[PDB]
Write a protein that binds this ligand. Structure first.
Ligand SMILES: Nc1ncnc2c1ncn2[C@@H]1O[C@H](COP(=O)(O)O)[C@@H](O)[C@H]1O
Length: 128
């Protein structure tokens, strides 16, 4: 993740998009912090409080075996942004808008986090 960023702010910047936006504009806020074009990225069309609430679901196993994953109560509007062409930072994307559930790994916020929910998302483990 970018150096100096809190885990949940990187999560916010990569997966929080309540107001849907075109992939090719939105992906620039991600790739300005990366060295190569991100190949696949999912934007969740929900505010941060409702993903924070997902962290209050029962603990489930993440893909990597951790036990801090949480599934959403239901499906939400979301956009997948798959890379198709370009050399970084001129990344070009094709979009796919679906309605699906998701799974997030959560932990307590850090001291610098502006929204102190008792558990915040820090990675998107799945799109079911
Ligand atoms: N099950 C999945 N299906 C599709 N994309 C996924 C899945 N799990 C993770 N990703 C992608 O991996 C990234 C996870 O971000 P992070 O949790 O910050 O490492 C997201 O940008 C998603 O696009």
């Amino acid at each position: 993740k970018p150096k100096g960023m809190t885990s949940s702010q990187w999560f916010k910047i990569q997966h929080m998009q309540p107001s849907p936006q075109a992939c090719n504009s939105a992906m620039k806020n991600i790739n300005k912090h990366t060295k190569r074009c991100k190949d696949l990225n999912t934007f969740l069309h929900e505010p941060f409080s409702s993903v924070a609430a997902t962290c209050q679901t029962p603990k489930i196993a993440c893909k990597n075996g951790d036990k801090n994953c949480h599934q959403s109560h239901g499906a939400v509007s979301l956009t997948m942004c798959k890379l198709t062409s370009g050399k970084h930072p001129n990344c070009r994307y094709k979009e796919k808008r679906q309605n699906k559930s998701y799974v997030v790994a959560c932990k307590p916020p850090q001291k610098k986090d502006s929204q102190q929910f008792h558990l915040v998302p820090v990675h998107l483990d799945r799109v079911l």
